[PDB]
Design a protein around this nucleic acid. Sequence first.
RNA 1: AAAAAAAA
RNA 2: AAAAAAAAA
RNA 3: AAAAAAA
RNA 4: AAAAAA
RNA 5: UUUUUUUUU
RNA 6: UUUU
RNA 7: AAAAAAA
RNA 8: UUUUUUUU
RNA 9: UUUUUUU
RNA 10: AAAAAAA
RNA 11: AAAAA
RNA 12: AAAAAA
RNA 13: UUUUUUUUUUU
RNA 14: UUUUU
Lengths: 51, 53, 144, 144, 106, 144, 143, 145, 150
Amino acid sequence: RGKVKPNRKSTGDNSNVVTMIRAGSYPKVNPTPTWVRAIPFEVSVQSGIAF
Amino acid sequence: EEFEGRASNINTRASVGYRIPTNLRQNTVAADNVCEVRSNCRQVALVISCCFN
Amino acid sequence: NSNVVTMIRAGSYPKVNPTPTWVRAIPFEVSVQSGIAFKVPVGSLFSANFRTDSFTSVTVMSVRAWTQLTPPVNEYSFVRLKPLFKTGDSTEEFEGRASNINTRASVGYRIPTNLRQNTVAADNVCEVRSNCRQVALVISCCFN
Amino acid sequence: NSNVVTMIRAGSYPKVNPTPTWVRAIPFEVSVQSGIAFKVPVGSLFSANFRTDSFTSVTVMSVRAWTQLTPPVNEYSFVRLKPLFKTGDSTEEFEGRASNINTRASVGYRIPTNLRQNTVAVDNVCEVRSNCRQVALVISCCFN
Amino acid sequence: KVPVGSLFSANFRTDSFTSVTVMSVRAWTQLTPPVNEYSFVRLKPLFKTGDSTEEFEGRASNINTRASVGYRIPTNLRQNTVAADNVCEVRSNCRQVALVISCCFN
Amino acid sequence: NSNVVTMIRAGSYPKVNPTPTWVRAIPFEVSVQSGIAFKVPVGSLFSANFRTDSFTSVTVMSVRAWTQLTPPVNEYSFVRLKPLFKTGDSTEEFEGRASNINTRASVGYRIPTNLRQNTVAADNVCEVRSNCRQVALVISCCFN
Amino acid sequence: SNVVTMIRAGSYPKVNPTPTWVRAIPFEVSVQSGIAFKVPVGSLFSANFRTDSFTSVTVMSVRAWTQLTPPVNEYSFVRLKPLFKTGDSTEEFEGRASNINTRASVGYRIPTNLRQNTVAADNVCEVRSNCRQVALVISCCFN
Amino acid sequence: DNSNVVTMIRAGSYPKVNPTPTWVRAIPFEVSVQSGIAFKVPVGSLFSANFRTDSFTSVTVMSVRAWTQLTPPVNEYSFVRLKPLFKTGDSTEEFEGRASNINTRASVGYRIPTNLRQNTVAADNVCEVRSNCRQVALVISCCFN
Amino acid sequence: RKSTGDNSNVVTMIRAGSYPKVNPTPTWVRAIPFEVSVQSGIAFKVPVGSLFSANFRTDSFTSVTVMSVRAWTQLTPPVNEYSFVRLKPLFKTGDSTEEFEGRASNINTRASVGYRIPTNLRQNTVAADNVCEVRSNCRQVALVISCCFN
RNA sequence: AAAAAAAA
RNA sequence: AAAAAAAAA
RNA sequence: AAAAAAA
RNA sequence: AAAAAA
RNA sequence: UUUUUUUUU
RNA sequence: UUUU
RNA sequence: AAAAAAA
RNA sequence: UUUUUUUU
RNA sequence: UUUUUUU
RNA sequence: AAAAAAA
RNA sequence: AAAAA
RNA sequence: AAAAAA
RNA sequence: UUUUUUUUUUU
RNA sequence: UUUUU
Ligand SMILES: [Cl-]
Ligand SMILES: [Cl-]
Ligand SMILES: [Mg+2]
Ligand SMILES: [Mg+2]
């Protein structure tokens, strides 16, 4: 391989500094994606009629 | 269908739901309706599980 | 599977939240001048074009940058990123250069968990430096 | 293997259908302008150039796009795809950008099984946005 | 054109339903074919999102025997239909066709 | 699968074909005269009623025949098939009879791989002899 | 079983009064010195082979033997050049005799892709030899 | 894959050849039968250009099968009987088959044992055929030589 | 110990027997590369006679069994366009209506595509015959044909 | 199961 | 359910 | 295996 | 099998 | 794995 | 348990 | 790839 | 191994 | 996965 | 051993 | 069990 | 085997 | 990281 | 390897 550019990522899952991300080609993007949600809202009913 | 639930305690809410099968899961715009709600109470709370797209 | 509606034997009313969090990967562009750094504003993430205009704060996790336009004549594209923090800006210049003049230059940096706090629209994400006039950004963040 | 004809001990007249279905990937081009979306019509799939002039309906499964012409000067190619449905058009903008100016920009989306209904010539598949003047489309569908 | 309204009837206990999801449609010739002919029956599925062009045909190998054929509706096309809608077209050399439609009333 | 559209990370433009092949079974009927053989034309396969009017050649793999109408009085139905080729016509008479007067008479033959060349509309498939005046055919072939 | 037994026959089966029959047809041809002779396919259809009821045949392999003695001081040889309607070949499969009193043999096999039918007007192959006659054995499928 | 060109065969000495070999066949042909009368099936019916067998003068019959070719009389069911005949001695068996449906053919057959599988020339008779149908279809598994 | 021998330094004798079966003009499997001129919107029929040439050592053949055809664009495409190429197989028993198309995802990169002929359609073709039609936005296309000369 | 001819 | 067509992402 | 049905 | 990521 | 052709319980 |  | 089954 | 038999 | 009849 | 090719 | 580096 | 540390 | 044909010693 | 039954 080679030698180092010192990004001190301590123990991998426990770094306390910013670490360089070796990015590549521009990915597939979507600024307006989907969203699965559970929407809570109230509706008003009368006694004997449907709504 | 009239999927109905009744509260066994006068102080407790009455609950009931229904699941939509996969063959009937298309899109619905604002002008559309979801379901008809009937109750002896003046207001009903709804929690709708859905996918926004 | 089932072809008709089925009853859901629901119980007590559950814990709800009409305005939940959202983990996203926001793509947007910024203009970059030659020899000048551009402080990427956090407010660029809050927009109706990203469905995030309902938020006021966001937790940035990683930042990635690509060159959006062609470099000057005879040069290879490059891009730099300097992480900015309200508790103290950094001095790293995570630089990425292209090996083909016709190809973009990409680079990024990951924010440590200890430096993942909320940021408002007035704040800035990072400084960007490039020989190209535009930089394509994709920021992995947490809207709350 | 053999070298001459062989007799087939046939039985009752089977179930026949002179006009069956056909799963295809239809390649055709559309003209796109800068900053404006083009609604790709489903009628483009029905033509004698695709052996589908006998079908009146089709079930689209997945749509893929490719920039068919070169991007403007100093820019990289991109292409957006907004899925359209008769029960409700979407707002997604699946976008793919080219990392090389001389290379196409590719993106695509898959229609879920719950949304795979028939579409006639009057209907539209998706909106296509691109900085390139034309876009190549390969639509995996089921003609019926 | 076979109307969906033929499914909502008191003769089937279904006069309380207004919509139905059809799963599979199969048809049998109900009367004898013309002279010198073997029976046949065709079915062209119809949908509100797009009519089809398939002619699922079945023929009888015996002139005294019915001709039968059917088609299955995929899960992605199993939506509701009301009385104003049509299930499919029917073509045959016989003057009546018996249909046994497997559906889900809701 | 899911209930919403998903993004496809498409790559380079694929190798496409707008007019592909199609293997089918084509049901079509022919009229036969008493004591007279009838040559089956290959042009009967190419038709808008079979979605094959876009093809000009076809490779036939097998032929199957049924008596379409009733036989003469006191007789049981029979049908013969003599294969034909442009390199040389055959003399085989693959004959099938009915054991019940009301039942169709059926027979079929298979073409070996070495004899599976293309045939145009001007060519002929086989000869059909029968005491009935109509014979139904279901030919398994490859349109190209 | 030394007596007739009863066969419980069922429905009328599929019949074919004129089947295909696979054969190995032997015949001879006259050859001149230096001249190549085209072997006609029509020789395969003859009452001497029980094949006068056939009009087509699918050839699979051809084998050749010298039928007469070679010229003086020479050893027998024979060459075969395959011929097709889609295009003639230029191969000359040759076999020579290591004994002057012994025949010479050679043969070629027709691959599956080239095993189409041939009528009487066609030709099988070209034959060259120093002997004035050649004996051919053609493994073919009549139909 | 398969070979796509002509390939040389390394043939040797001239082999044993035979231009007029034998042929195991199943010959279909029809015969006309009257009511209450038995029709002797001639062996010469097997030798014809319609069967590619006019070059054979002898044949060794192995088994015979019959089917009624025409409809039976009114209100009756089809039947057919077969009586094996040999030059060394005619049998007296009447292998009969009846149709359980008036619209269906009647069928029956008989197998010849290897000891009785000699040759028969055109002037010989295979069997006798009785039936209430005016025509019978015959399928004879035999070995031509 | 003493059994090492496959590297000969001198001539050795060959104990030959009877005269073998010989063929002075045998077959040959090849991959013939050549180019053709293509016009815009016009289909060019590729002649089989292009295979029989002294430039390929195949000028002695008169027939060939084509197995597969591959095509690459030989010149640059028009301005703003990516290269493409199409192929339509042709047969003496009946021409095909398929147009196997392969485009270029890079304007500077060739466009490639090819098709394989099935065993049932691998017959001989003489010089007067044609292999396939070729369409391309480029003015020249390069071909490589895997074929069996005979 | 079946009289007849056989059969360590 | 032979080919053509998304992929186990 | 889907739907309706008892603890 | 949604949206993010050694 | 799916759409149409052929095989085999 | 009711269906094709 | 030809005769009488294919369980 | 010849003619009648025994749960599709 | 039964086998027996000429290239 | 020598002629397509394949990631 | 024979030879020739 | 650099510089930090249950 | 996997083949069709021209000769070809040796297990 | 090369030369010999
Ligand atoms: Cl300029
Ligand atoms: Cl030495
Ligand atoms: Mg309450
Ligand atoms: Mg009867």
